[model samples]
Target chain A: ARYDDILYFPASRYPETGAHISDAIKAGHSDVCTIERSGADKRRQESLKGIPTKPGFDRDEWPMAMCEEGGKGASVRYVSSSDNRGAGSWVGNRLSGFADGTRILFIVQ
Target chain B: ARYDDILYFPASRYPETGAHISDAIKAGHSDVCTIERSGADKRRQESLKGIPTKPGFDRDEWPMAMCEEGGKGASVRYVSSSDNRGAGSWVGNRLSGFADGTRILFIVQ
Candidate 1:
């Protein structure tokens, strides 16, 4: 799915035939980004705690889905990948300083 | 159908359930921003010529659909709207001198 293919979206939008494509991902789906499910959840300060960056957890790849609740967000999922595709995980952390749900667009290296 | 919802994409993508959506728009299909068809076309440098934006033509509302060829775009559809929702045409143009594909997310005043 190239760079920005993930379509992470609001649970409200999930009802919009969202399950159709999401189902495909789930079916052909062998991947998962843990914590991604709660990334978009309200209260960013606390959700970031105890979340695993490992697999078997969550994420949104859609465009507007970039922000949470409003248009005030300053960063996004693509930030990590496009910002530092070759950087070490440490470098990536510095480059993107990604928040939960921010890395939902990745497909692994 | 709030802001940032249009899914305009390359004709190549139209084959992937893209029609399922565009069809709904086509079916519930009474309203349209005409020239929007060409807004996503490649020739942005030229396509911007004489395209009437006066209700008769013009638009994309999707997120990544904001750019062309790649992710180098500087603006988006929600820009015009979120930029200045109340400004007059003169002010809007000043606030969001949007290109073709740039204003695809509007719904009319």
Candidate 2:
């Protein structure tokens, strides 16, 4: 039987600002199943949310996921508030590019 | 004060597979906050997880977010299973290509 493990990396551990995360994935590890994005806008000055689908991976991209295909799966969920006052930060500054503080959770299959 | 509203989009509603989600953000609406990715692997048959950071966005990419900068924030969380028998799929087939079934959640701030 194959045992799976889920690991968590804080935003501070991430090295790139926006467009270099993909390289991180390719060079980072072989266990990477999927990737996700999130964080504060600093530019928008409001609460923001990203859609899973995008034109293509670009610099400073934000995509969230749950699990791998054809295997035990995973899911992403969120909770936010209006007026720029909420709880989590999703992908957070670690991945997104903004310095604002954001938080994320990881579940494994 | 600006009121915030959170909405949820399933994997099916998403159009592109991996790439193109970014364009969807630009043309889809003005309130796009952030995006995330997740799911099973028909190729690997293993559970997968994506990080928030990546090399400039490319095709079939996945990124997750929380909130806009300097404003109320949001966070993305996950829960996965081990044996390809889980509950959520994160982004899902709607965003990613694999026709595997996945689930996701959306929170607003």
Candidate 3:
């Protein structure tokens, strides 16, 4: 199936999360992901498996818990809490027009 | 009624339309607008009367035709096609989490 659109994450604005996601993409993970509206918490729990939490950072995962590619073996990184949450809000808003299962390519710049 | 959220329009990215909307908001128009999922075409038709088309520009109106506050007596302006369409896409995506009839306050900056 073809990708409906591209989702951009500004590295300048979300440096930590952006860098982590960029690294995730470079580490053999697919830049393409599918939206998964349901079971996001379950995916997050599975993805966070051995990842330890930091005092001021949130455990940010590539592919995102909201994406089908996330969970179990997904890459995780410690990102600034503000940056991680802000990135989540930004991504959620940007992807709002598309339905669940829509294919999207992620780009960080 | 309470506004579910605020929709921000970055004038830096969408200058022409942003200024026009800013002007519209300042000229006795309400910053608050309600999303109208239906009858947008009819509202746009009513709003575009006497407004001449400009090449390379889209006839932008505020409150938008998709807003219940739009249509007859709405403010109008000529904005670059790219800026107008981009602003529309931005607003539509941002408002996707909200349902029709949701009260939204527009802020241009």
Candidate 4:
């Protein structure tokens, strides 16, 4: 099908979809963005719809979400883990090269 | 005071403890490790004694804990958030440059 983005992991779901992470990613194109951006590897992503409604993701690149709890449309929140904040930092750095109207909500790293 | 280790953050506890993170850290020394290691930064650590009694930590460096559900002494479980796995990887690397039978059971990065 067609999607703006989705969380296609290296496995079909998690620990029981594929053998190698890259392979699973290559096989599945539901919506996961495997473009391999700058200063990033072992990367993973998920669309807003697929993300949990609750507000908590260790190092999730919650690239898309409503900016406010009671705002219009959506916003961005580049949430990520503190341990592996390179991608998060990298994401923020990349965001710097552009305007900020949407993309991420939180950057915990 | 004197302590083997503690989670003395740059802030007193979080959010309202200090002006800047480093400021709180400079003024406190409970048991947080902030030596700054390789392949890691924006780092934060806490001593096992100061850690919360639970199995989850967004990106906590649970340096020491009981190896098993009911082990004799204690072991390590360098847990952390997956998004910030650099420190986690760095910690594991440091551990690797030595021996096992101690240090970390769950590297949740």
Candidate 5:
């Protein structure tokens, strides 16, 4: 009797599938890092003393959401982003500083 | 022979079409008002006495649109409206004041 040795792999282990799997892993890793960082920051802030903070308010805190609340006043400002290939910032904090980078500095009073 | 009196009307002027026409009139009127108001305001400001206004700068003035300009930095703030049927404000100025109404005050820095 001759013994034959062959490695058995699942059909989902093809190169294309592996690449997709790798991409998913990278995405998951990044998401986990983001959540962890956010959680850590929140916890740090919570532990800090003498930080002035107020109780969370409803949309009442911001008048912009009032029109839907059946109140007087039209919305004040309109904002939109450029196309991704055009002049639009990717959604994150890294682009917060550049002029035209989507910072809140210009819009805020 | 008896004389008959009749008013000839276009087929497009039926009662249903008349109601649609009325609604369309209202919409067109409102749109005209908005454009006129904006244009009038711009012209008034342009004609103002010693307003100390500078030449309009590109997004470079704001720094928010910079990321799309291929620079480092991520967009700073994310804003969205409540659903129209939910709590979204209608667009325009009269509704621009309530805390929930959209205002440029808080969003600008």
Candidate 6:
């Protein structure tokens, strides 16, 4: 596997999301993600329905609802809006070339 | 997670399987397994079709064919027959009460 197969979530920029993801993994969610880049919006909608919005925080879901192993039963957390959005784009740009179903390891540093 | 959720593959007892599992994980096969439990023989048969048997060695598969994440595309290796069979019963006894779809983490000791 190449270096690109690893997705590093920097705790420096996404503290809340990092914590949430770690907690989610500990609670039996997968850290080894099978990317399902398609239908991400639909998955997000399915995962975030019952949760109410926070004032300045964004509702973040993991394994990331976009992942094949995630969605309806995903763990959700209220994360800093800037942090969540930044991490989203950061992950997107990094995994831009990865094919759907490409399994990537998530390392929260 | 409880201690039961973590399956430790003792390097001392099953060195080849441990090494194979580590290599498989590095090659993007999952270390987090979703247990299948049923139809294991069928899955194992499907996964071992083309691999010729080695004398005195057993064909061991990971994610173990019995896992939902395994079969067909699984990585197979020739391992010590005694060691592989012993490890099989060891894992079976440890995971006896776990249900299908229960997620487990594989830790190679």
Provide the TM-score for each candidate, comma-separated.
0.19, 0.16, 0.52, 0.19, 0.14, 0.47
| iRMS, all models | 14.6, 11.6, 6.4, 15.2, 14.7, 14.7
The most accurate candidate by TM-score is: 3
Tell me the tens digit of each residue's lDDT in model 1 across B1-109.
Answer: 4233332333332222233224434444322221221223343433344433444212222212223321223121222332222222232223121222332342322
Write the residue-wise lDDT of candidate 2 on B2-108 in tens digits. 32333454324332321133343444323343321122122112112242423332223222322221011212222122211111234222233211122232321
Q: What is the lDDT of candidate 2?
A: 0.26
Best by DockQ: 3
lDDT of 1 at A106: 31
lDDT of 4 by residue, B1-109 (tens): 3222222222222322222223323433212332212212211222334435444433233222111122121222333334224443343333321111222222121
User: Candidate 2, residues A15-69: lDDT per residue as tens digits?
Assistant: 3321133333444322343322221123112212342422332223222332121
Error of 1 at B56 (Å): 3.2
Candidate 6 is scored at a TM of 0.47
Model 4 chain A worst lDDT window (10 residues): A64-73
Docking class of 3: incorrect
**First chain of model 3: TM-score?**
0.92
List the DockQ of the predictions in order.
Answer: 0.02, 0.02, 0.07, 0.02, 0.02, 0.01
Of the native A-B interface contacts, what share survives in model 4?
0.00
Error of 2 at A28 (Å): 31
Question: At residue B12, what lDDT does model 2 achieve?
Answer: 40
Q: Write the per-residue lDDT of candidate 5 for residues B17-77, one digit (tens) a residue.
A: 2232234334331111111111222333333324343333111111111111111221111
- Which CAPRI quality tier does the interface of model 4 achieve? incorrect
Looking at candidate 5 chain A, the ten consecutive residues that score lowest on lDDT are A58-67
- Counting clashing residue pairs in each candidate, in order, gives 17, 103, 0, 31, 41, 0
| Residues B1-109, model 6: lDDT tens digits | 5223777778788787788898999898988877665557678888899899999999989888767777789999999898888887677655543445567899886
Worst 10 residues of 2 chain A by lDDT: A79-88
